[PDB]
Amino acid sequence: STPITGKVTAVIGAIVDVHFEQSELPAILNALEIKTPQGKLVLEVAQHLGENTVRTIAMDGTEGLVRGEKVLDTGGPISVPVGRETLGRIINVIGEPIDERGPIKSKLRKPIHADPPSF
Amino acid sequence: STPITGKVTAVIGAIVDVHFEQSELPAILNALEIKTPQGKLVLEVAQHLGENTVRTIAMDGTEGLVRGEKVLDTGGPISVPVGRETLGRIINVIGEPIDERGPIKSKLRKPIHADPPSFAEQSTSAEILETGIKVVDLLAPYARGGKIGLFGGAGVGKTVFIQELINNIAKAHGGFSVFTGVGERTREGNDLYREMKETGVINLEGESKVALVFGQMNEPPGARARVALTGLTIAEYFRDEEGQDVLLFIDNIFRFTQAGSEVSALLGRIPSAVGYQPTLATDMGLLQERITTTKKGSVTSVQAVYVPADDLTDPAPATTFAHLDATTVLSRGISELGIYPAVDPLDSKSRLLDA
Amino acid sequence: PPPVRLFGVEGTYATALYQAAAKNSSIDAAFQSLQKVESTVKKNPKLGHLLLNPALSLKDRNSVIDAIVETHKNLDGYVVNLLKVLSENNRLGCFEKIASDFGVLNDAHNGLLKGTVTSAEPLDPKSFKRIEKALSASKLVGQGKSLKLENVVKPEIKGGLIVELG
Amino acid sequence: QPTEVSSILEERIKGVSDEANLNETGRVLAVGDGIARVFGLNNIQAEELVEFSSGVKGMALNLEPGQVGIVLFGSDRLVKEGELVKRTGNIVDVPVGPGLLGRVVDALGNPIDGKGPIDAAGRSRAQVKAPGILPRRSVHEPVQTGLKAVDALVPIGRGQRELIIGD
Amino acid sequence: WFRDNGKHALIVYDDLSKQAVAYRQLSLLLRRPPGREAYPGDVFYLHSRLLERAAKLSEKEGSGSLTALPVIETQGGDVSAYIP
Amino acid sequence: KAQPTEVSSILEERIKGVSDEANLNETGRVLAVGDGIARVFGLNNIQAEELVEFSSGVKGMALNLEPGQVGIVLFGSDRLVKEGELVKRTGNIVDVPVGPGLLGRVVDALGNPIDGKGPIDAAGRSRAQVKAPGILPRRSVHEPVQTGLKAVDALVPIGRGQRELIIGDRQTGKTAVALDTILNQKRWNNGSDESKKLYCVYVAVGQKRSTVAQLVQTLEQHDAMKYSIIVAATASEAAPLQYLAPFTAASIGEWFRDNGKHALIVYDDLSKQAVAYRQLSLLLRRPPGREAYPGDVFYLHSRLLERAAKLSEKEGSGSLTALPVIETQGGDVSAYIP
Ligand SMILES: Nc1ncnc2c1ncn2[C@@H]1O[C@H](COP(=O)(O)OP(=O)(O)OP(=O)(O)O)[C@@H](O)[C@H]1O
Ligand SMILES: [Mg+2]
């Protein structure tokens, strides 16, 4: 599908506001993406402000964020590797292996935000 | 040149809002002036609110004000008449003689807002200053350029200690002390002036050794927060242009802190800890860093400190404690029964008492 | 009694303009002149709306609003008063124009793009919203098919969800 | 986002662009809880007395650039949103003199004892500055309260301020 | 009036805490920035203006006098409260 | 269109640097000077915490980057900045000159020399706020730093890479023990083996300039000016300078730590650091917390301190030792900041 793209309007400390386009509004708690020179900066969506603008939470430092930078929507919540391969691998808030023991070879990837298992 | 003029838009309590024209706004802390029938209402610019409007704090009572009245910018901060002519005269925060003994004939006119001497100019040696009082200069000696805190009270000869210090410093090196009656009670002030004349320190026909600057307690907030700066400017001039070991007396540093907290509330700043201004430490440092010893001369401050609720933990007492060096706790009738100085040597301590 | 509520928030200027027009006359001339003004300001956007910035002094605002009224004084009626009041008040002049257009269209047009379960765009040029929606929907389904894309319609998905929930 | 909302609030709500000469007069914008915002009064002074159409008086504490906040000496019942208001031209003042002896008056000099009109030797401002530093002298004359505890341990003098602090 | 006319007068301000409470009500209802326990800023200034008016005039002005006896009520013996 | 074109042209004049020149894309206009902030319209290519000049010598670093304008804090007195002034972006994140050309010199929170000994020689310019090393690069402390105190040596030992906190009341000798450490370092700082060489950094937050001068004189007496750097943020300085100084000193120390050497850094009176941050926050209309300290007081000290640890052999086996100073008020260690 077409990559959902928008413009960054406000960068307030760890809070980033992104303006989007016609019916391109992402979902709450859904990973976004900023191509930073260091690496990948995801913008978890916290609240909707209207006028095709969403308030997001940055999972990394917001250093060097210029208003109007290109943003990319992942399409879902933050995804992390899951499985027995993760045993012995030190991972992070996003799931990248920070143990420099090679890439993680996970078979499944699950969303971070789930629901209580009812009764 | 063309004077900078504007129109008053709003007076909210002591806070006065004035609208200026394009490219005419002064910097903050600058002195403004309006013509009132009573005299000169002067406004210190605090914030720029945009749209060519500035928020100013009144140094005098703002009564009978009308929107659209003309205002004039002095050009800089509140400038106090400074010089040897100040000795023997009663001057206010705005630099007007309230002694009604004629105008002040000072040739120079310095702003009250200045910067402390740079790090290089700061003296690199802890120096001793003789006080004349035996117990004081033996057990709790004063620092040349120190921040001595007088922890006295009532009926303890707090004043007579002050005049003795003034006389001793005048005799010893060069002392021309400056008394700053922050929040003057205007009854104790009149009694103090009479005592000045009687003791001979203030000589109307002759030469005086002290300049009496004080803003009375009935003045609007902010003037009580600037009288100390005026006195400090006077002392700094007497130090940076004459090389003397000037003294400086503060009526109550707690009153200065209370005025500073009071000003911040009027502007709209959120009080930080205990109804206290968020800039308590900043204001205290700004006041207490210019009172220091330099290569040319030195200025030593003797401030009277009031401890709220007898609580040593209160933020303002601690902030003052940051700058004390030595202290003098005048005994509340403990040593006054007998020894006239009554300094309670087992309570008054000094940091410089080292080999 | 204006037909619609703009609920203030920079929108009260449009309601005030409409009431000033309605008290005597010229519901249309002022509005068409304002449309021409918006066309002019969007004609040179780098000089049009960048000049509506708030870093621009009061007499600068007087100069720019005087500069707006040209080309045979197109600003007719109380719209000049609107430019004046916007000079000494909030500056940018786009949103309240849209609010005023919304109000005048409710006065004359009464068109809403409904369709409920259908995501059509059936504007209705009639003050009677009783059966004209039928003709509008029939015309917009017989021809065009602008979007008409529900992607998936709600009843079946929500019913399946609630059924599988028990 | 190209632009944002111009107004989140505005002191001006009726942009008709008419009705001049509100320098000595004005219009009530909003009232409630003993206060009344008033549009106009371009020549009002600080804490100036002001008169309303319903007969209740006011005192001009808050003069914002747009409106003036008038504090009200009576009930908010009498006033309305849209009443005409006129300035009196005088600051707070009270009839002063020796005729006040033996009479009980209000906070503005009105006799509340019901004994007749008040005789006054003058009318001084309520808010007047205190005497300066020189025109004062030391207190020497004593004030005899009649309490032996007060008169012996904590003497009071003519021109002194003494606080009666207690529960 | 009495003080400046050369006579001696005694003034009993009585309750000033209620006066401060009234000023609190006024300032809060006028949207002024509150302070310690929501008291207005210029209440210290207010009471200073009120109390400093009492004085002992010198002989040149008539040797008048005003002796002020304000009465402040404290709650629970707290003399450390802001108005006290 | 000719009349509209020429009237728009004359509109382009007298507006000057608000829309006309530079398009206010690399420049800005001061909308209003606040408590310690400066709302600036323009600066469309500005990035966050980018150093900005206010055309008066004072510096600024951007917190608020909302769509309308940019909120800039003032690195200095706000008297210098004026509404309507032209500002320009420096194009770099806040950074301090780092390198081996700083020992024997004293500087401010911006790396500008104050001692008057001339310009500072720099081997680079690292960001003031840099990311701390992760979980991988560190290594357990094994080399002991000798303080010279029998109490601190036999008991409560301190190693290279450990953060030991000095807690005490107003007059207890925290500065005394820190100075004893820095002077005891002289034994190995005059040798040849770099593994035992320990360079030092002193941080003066809210201290008196007179006290700093006396301290510099004391290091002069014992020949401790070398292998030591002092950053000064006096009580008269603006709150942002005090808030920034510890991070810049951390960068100075991290230079040595990442270059294989070992450095001592003393964070004197981080309580006044927290006070300055509280002042900055409440001047920014931030919600107060416990004792009105903003919630990020923990985050400040956390990010500040965790930048000092022993590096593993693969990086170069460098170390950075932090000695914070906290003044407990009343002899209690159960207060929020302590
Ligand atoms: N080992 C010591 N021998 C002699 N005097 C000491 C010693 N340690 C501290 N002192 C003295 O104790 C006092 C306080 O010590 P120091 O200068 O280290 O301050 P501190 O307790 O760290 O804090 P602050 O600067 O806030 O007072 C000074 O007078 C100092 O000379
Ligand atoms: Mg110390």
Short mmCIF file of N, CA and C in Angstrom, two decimals, chain C residues 9-10 12-13 16 23 81 85 89-92 94-95, chain D residues 3-13 15-17:
data_model
loop_
_atom_site.label_atom_id
_atom_site.label_comp_id
_atom_site.label_asym_id
_atom_site.label_seq_id
_atom_site.Cartn_x
_atom_site.Cartn_y
_atom_site.Cartn_z
N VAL C 9 -14.82 31.75 19.28
CA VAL C 9 -13.46 31.29 18.98
C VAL C 9 -13.07 31.77 17.59
N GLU C 10 -12.89 33.08 17.45
CA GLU C 10 -12.44 33.74 16.22
C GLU C 10 -13.55 33.71 15.18
N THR C 12 -16.73 34.66 15.95
CA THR C 12 -17.70 35.71 16.25
C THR C 12 -17.57 36.90 15.31
N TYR C 13 -16.41 37.09 14.68
CA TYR C 13 -16.26 38.16 13.70
C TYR C 13 -17.18 37.93 12.50
N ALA C 16 -20.72 38.67 13.55
CA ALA C 16 -20.91 40.11 13.65
C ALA C 16 -21.07 40.74 12.27
N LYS C 23 -28.86 43.67 9.36
CA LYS C 23 -29.61 44.75 9.98
C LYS C 23 -30.14 45.73 8.94
N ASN C 81 -14.43 47.96 7.84
CA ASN C 81 -14.42 47.95 9.29
C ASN C 81 -13.86 46.64 9.82
N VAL C 85 -10.72 46.38 12.34
CA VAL C 85 -10.75 45.71 13.64
C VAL C 85 -9.75 44.57 13.68
N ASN C 89 -6.57 43.79 16.28
CA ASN C 89 -6.92 42.54 16.96
C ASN C 89 -6.25 41.41 16.18
N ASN C 90 -6.70 40.18 16.43
CA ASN C 90 -6.14 39.00 15.77
C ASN C 90 -6.06 39.20 14.26
N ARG C 91 -4.97 38.71 13.68
CA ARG C 91 -4.54 39.16 12.36
C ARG C 91 -5.04 38.28 11.21
N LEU C 92 -4.68 36.99 11.21
CA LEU C 92 -4.90 36.17 10.03
C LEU C 92 -6.39 36.07 9.71
N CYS C 94 -8.37 34.10 7.35
CA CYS C 94 -8.85 33.01 6.52
C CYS C 94 -9.99 32.22 7.16
N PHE C 95 -9.85 31.85 8.44
CA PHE C 95 -10.83 30.97 9.07
C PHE C 95 -12.20 31.63 9.19
N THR D 3 -1.99 27.37 9.14
CA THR D 3 -2.27 28.42 10.11
C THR D 3 -3.03 27.83 11.29
N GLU D 4 -3.16 28.63 12.35
CA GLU D 4 -3.84 28.24 13.57
C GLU D 4 -4.95 29.24 13.88
N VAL D 5 -5.76 28.90 14.88
CA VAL D 5 -6.90 29.72 15.27
C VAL D 5 -6.40 31.06 15.80
N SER D 6 -6.97 32.15 15.28
CA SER D 6 -6.55 33.49 15.69
C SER D 6 -6.89 33.76 17.15
N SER D 7 -8.15 33.52 17.53
CA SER D 7 -8.66 33.93 18.82
C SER D 7 -9.01 32.72 19.68
N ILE D 8 -8.44 32.67 20.88
CA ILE D 8 -8.95 31.83 21.95
C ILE D 8 -9.81 32.62 22.92
N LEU D 9 -9.67 33.95 22.96
CA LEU D 9 -10.50 34.83 23.77
C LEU D 9 -10.38 36.23 23.19
N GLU D 10 -11.34 37.08 23.54
CA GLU D 10 -11.34 38.45 23.05
C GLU D 10 -12.18 39.31 23.97
N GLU D 11 -11.62 40.44 24.41
CA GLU D 11 -12.39 41.39 25.21
C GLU D 11 -13.48 42.05 24.38
N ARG D 12 -13.29 42.16 23.07
CA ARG D 12 -14.28 42.78 22.20
C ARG D 12 -15.14 41.67 21.61
N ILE D 13 -16.46 41.75 21.82
CA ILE D 13 -17.38 40.72 21.35
C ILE D 13 -18.49 41.26 20.48
N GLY D 15 -18.59 43.69 17.49
CA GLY D 15 -17.87 44.50 16.53
C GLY D 15 -18.77 45.26 15.58
N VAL D 16 -19.57 46.18 16.12
CA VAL D 16 -20.47 46.99 15.30
C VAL D 16 -19.79 48.26 14.78
N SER D 17 -18.72 48.71 15.42
CA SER D 17 -17.96 49.89 15.01
C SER D 17 -18.86 51.13 14.98
#
